[PDB]
Design a protein around this nucleic acid. Structure first.
Length: 54
RNA sequence: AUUGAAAGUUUUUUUUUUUUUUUUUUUUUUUUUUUUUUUUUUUUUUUU
């Protein structure tokens, strides 16, 4: 908008996309992904709490 | 005390001059600082 020449009155980014301000989940190229580190940590926690001699 | 003698073979003269141990002669010709080595492992973006 011509360097926002003293208007600042259009919704612009609000309506251009469909993502409000929130806590973003980790995703790769618009594909939601569960981190491998998270899965490994969960598995290790389960194994430690389950295996007796851990 | 000889026939019987008293005389320096001496004075004087530079073995000196002319002549560069000199000219030419590159301590160089060759030799890859390479060569084996994964910036790797451990860690749940998360609670009253």
């Amino acid at each position: 908008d011509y360097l926002s020449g003293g208007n600042k009155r259009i919704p612009n980014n609000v309506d251009q996309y469909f993502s409000m301000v929130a806590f973003l989940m980790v995703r790769n190229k618009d594909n939601v992904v569960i981190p491998g580190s998270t899965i490994k940590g969960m598995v290790r926690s389960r194994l430690e709490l389950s295996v007796p001699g851990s």
